[PDB]
C-alpha cells in the first residue's frame, strides 16, 4: 500500500509567526465575566510556528514536490489545516512508528473518524488516497495507504468526524498523564496569506485514555491520482499546496477572559512581555500609570 | 504496474480439473484487487468474480455458484483457481484485470485498468 | 440489471457517431463502457463516467441520462475498429452487456 515520494532537499526553516492562537478551554466547568489564570500547556503568543506546505507547485509546468517529514511532539503540539480541498485527514503518533511499540492513527473519511492505538508500522511516507467519484464530489472515498499491518491492537474509536473563505482549523494534542484530549476549533478566513490579525476560542472535542508514549507524530494528507504512469515510479498526486501548520506547547500561566456568554474576548500571557506578565500579576487587563512588582515565570 | 502474465495455451481432457492463474511480476501483490473476466466468440464477456489478496475477500457470480474455488495467497505472490464441472459450452478464454483498489464498496470507484493477453482453454473429447 | 443494445452499428468515417446503451434503471447507477480491438486485449477508454483515462486520445465522450447512456465518437478513424461493452456495478457484481461492433466504411 507504501510507496516512495521522497525525493528532495529539505528547506530547513520552513516557518512564519503565529501571533495570537493556541488557548483552549483548559476545564469543563462554565465561567462568564470573570478573568481566570491558569498554569497549563500552551503554545506561546507571537511564537515561531512551522509553514510546512508539503506541495511546491514552482517552474513553468510546475511539480508537485511532496513533504511531509515526522515531527517531535515534545509534550504537546499545535496544528492547523487552513485547507481549501479538504486535503488534510488526520495525523499519526508513535516513539519509532515501526513495529515496537503503540502508534496512534487518525483518519477523518466521510462519516466515520477511525481511530487506531495499535502496534504496526510506518512507510516513510504515508498518506491517503481519494478519488471524487466522477467528479460528482459526493462519496468522496480513500484509501489505506497509510500502513500494513495491524497486529497486537489495543484500542479503537469511532465517532462524527471531525471534519465538516479559506476554513482555518485549529487543533491542539496534548498527551499528559496517560489521557490524550485531542481539542478542536474551525473558523472561517477570507485572507489568503498566514494567520489573521484576530483571537478565538479552541473548544475541547474528546479525550481518548490511549495510554501510550509518544515523541514524534506526523501528518496524514488525502492525494489524488491525477494520472497512473506506466511501470509505476509512485507517479506524482495532486492536493493542492497541503499548507498545514505546526506549534509546540510549552508549560506556562495564561490570563483568560471571559464574556458575559462565556466565550473568551482575549487573553494575555505571562511570560511573552512585562506589559503581559504585569497584567497577570495584577489579573486585570487594563494597567494604570505607575510602576508595578512582577514575580518570575521563566524555565 | 502489473502485467498480469500468464501461462499460454493448454490442452486437457473433457472432465478434468481445470487450474488457471495469472502472475503480477511488476508491482505489489496487494494494493490491487484481482478480477477475471471470460471473453468467448460471439457470446460477450462473462463475469464470475474477485478477490482482494489483502482483505482476502471474495465475491461471486449468480452463474458461477459453488463451480469455482478462488484462493489467493500474500506469501506465494500469486492468484490460482480450481475450476470444474466445465462443459464444452462453457469452453472460452478467460482473461485477469487489477482494479488498483482493496476495499469492497470501492470496486465502483476504478474501471479495469490492465487486462491479460488471455489464456485459451480446448477442451479434448 | 438487464442490458440490451442493437447488434451492430455502421458509420461513415469522419462522422460523430452515438451509441446508446439501454437496460432497467442505469441511470443514476453510473456505467462504465470499456473497448476491445480484434487481436489486442480489452482497454479502459471510458472509467465511471464517460471519463477518459489519461494516455487516451480526445475522441470518446459522452453523458449519463436519467435512463440511458449515452457515447459520442469524435474524430473516428480506420483504426477504431473494436468492440464496446457498457457495465456497472450493481448489487456488487458486474454485468457484460452482448456489445457492438463498429462498422466504417
Known amino acids: 500500500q507504501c510507496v516512495n515520494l521522497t525525493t528532495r532537499t529539505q528547506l530547513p526553516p520552513a516557518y512564519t509567526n503565529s501571533f495570537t492562537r493556541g488557548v483552549y478551554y483548559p476545564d469543563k466547568v462554565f465561567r462568564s465575566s470573570v478573568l481566570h489564570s491558569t498554569q497549563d500547556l500552551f503554545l506561546p503568543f507571537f511564537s515561531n510556528v512551522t509553514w510546512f506546505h508539503a506541495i511546491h507547485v514552482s517552474g513553468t509546468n510546475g511539480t508537485k514536490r511532496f513533504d511531509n517529514p515526522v515531527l517531535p511532539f515534545n509534550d504537546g503540539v499545535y496544528f492547523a489545516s487552513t485547507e481549501k480541498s479538504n486535503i488534510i485527514r488526520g495525523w499519526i503518533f508513535g516513539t519509532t512508528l515501526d513495529s515496537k511499540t503503540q502508534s496512534l492513527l487518525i483518519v477523518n473519511n466521510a462519516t466515520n473518524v477511525v481511530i487506531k492505538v495499535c502496534e504496526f508500522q510506518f512507510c516513510n511516507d504515508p498518506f491517503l488516497g481519494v478519488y471524487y467519484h466522477k467528479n460528482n464530489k459526493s462519496w468522496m472515498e480513500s484509501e489505506f495507504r497509510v500502513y500494513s499491518s495491524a497486529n497486537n491492537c489495543t484500542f479503537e474509536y469511532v465517532s462524527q468526524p471531525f471534519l465538516m473563505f479559506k476554513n482555518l482549523r485549529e487543533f491542539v494534542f496534548k498527551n499528559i498523564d496517560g489521557y490524550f484530549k485531542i481539542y478542536s476549533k474551525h473558523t472561517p478566513i477570507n485572507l489568503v496569506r498566514d494567520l489573521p490579525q484576530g483571537f478565538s476560542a479552541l473548544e475541547p472535542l474528546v479525550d481518548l485514555p490511549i495510554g501510550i508514549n509518544i515523541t514524534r507524530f506526523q501528518t496524514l494528507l488525502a492525494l489524488h491520482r491525477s494520472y497512473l504512469t506506466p511501470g509505476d515510479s509512485s507517479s506524482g498526486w495532486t492536493a493542492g499546496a497541503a499548507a498545514y501548520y505546526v506549534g509546540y506547547l510549552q508549560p506556562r500561566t495564561f490570563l483568560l477572559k471571559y464574556n458575559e456568554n462565556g466565550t473568551i474576548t482575549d487573553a494575555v500571557d505571562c511570560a511573552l512581555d512585562p506589559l503581559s506578565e504585569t497584567k497577570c500579576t495584577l489579573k486585570s487587563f487594563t494597567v494604570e500609570k505607575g510602576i508595578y512588582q512582577t514575580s518570575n515565570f521563566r524555565v | 504496474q502489473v502485467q498480469l502474465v500468464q501461462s499460454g495455451a493448454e490442452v486437457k481432457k473433457a472432465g478434468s480439473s481445470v487450474k488457471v492463474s495469472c502472475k503480477a511480476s511488476?508491482?505489489?501483490?496487494?494494493?490491487?484487487?484481482i478480477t477475471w473476466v471470460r471473453q468467448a466468440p460471439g457470446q460477450g464477456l462473462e463475469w464470475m468474480g474477485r478477490?482482494?489478496?489483502?482483505?482476502?475477500?471474495?465475491n461471486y457470480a449468480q452463474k458461477f455458484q459453488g463451480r469455482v474455488t478462488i484462493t489467493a495467497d500474500k506469501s506465494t505472490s500469486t492468484a490460482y483457481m480450481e475450476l470444474s464441472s466445465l462443459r464444452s459450452e462453457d469452453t472460452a478464454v478467460y482473461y485477469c484485470?487489477?482494479?488498483?483498489?482493496?476495499?469492497?464498496?470501492?470496486?465502483?470507484?476504478?474501471?479495469?485498468?490492465?487486462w491479460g493477453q488471455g489464456t485459451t482453454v480446448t477442451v479434448s473429447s | 440489471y438487464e442490458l440490451t443494445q442493437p447488434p451492430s452499428v455502421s458509420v461513415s468515417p469522419g462522422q460523430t457517431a452515438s451509441i446508446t446503451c439501454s437496460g432497467d434503471?442505469?441511470?443514476?447507477?453510473?456505467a462504465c463502457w470499456y473497448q476491445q480491438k480484434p487481436g489486442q486485449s480489452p482497454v479502459l477508454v471510458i472509467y465511471?463516467?464517460?471519463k477518459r483515462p489519461s494516455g487516451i486520445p480526445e475522441r470518446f465522450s459522452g453523458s449519463n441520462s436519467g435512463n440511458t447512456a449515452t457515447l459520442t465518437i469524435s474524430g473516428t478513424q480506420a483504426m477504431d475498429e473494436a468492440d464496446y461493452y457498457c457495465?456497472?456495478?450493481?448489487?456488487?457484481?458486474?454485468?457484460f452487456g452482448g456489445g457492438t461492433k463498429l462498422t466504417v466504411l
Open positions: 465511471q463516467d464517460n
Open positions: 434503471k442505469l441511470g443514476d447507477k453510473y
Open positions: 478477490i482482494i489478496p489483502i482483505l482476502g475477500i471474495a
Open positions: 511488476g508491482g505489489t501483490f496487494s494494493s490491487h484487487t
Open positions: 484485470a487489477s482494479l488498483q483498489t482493496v476495499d469492497t464498496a470501492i470496486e465502483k470507484y476504478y474501471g479495469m485498468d490492465v
Open positions: 457495465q456497472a456495478w450493481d448489487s456488487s457484481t458486474a454485468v
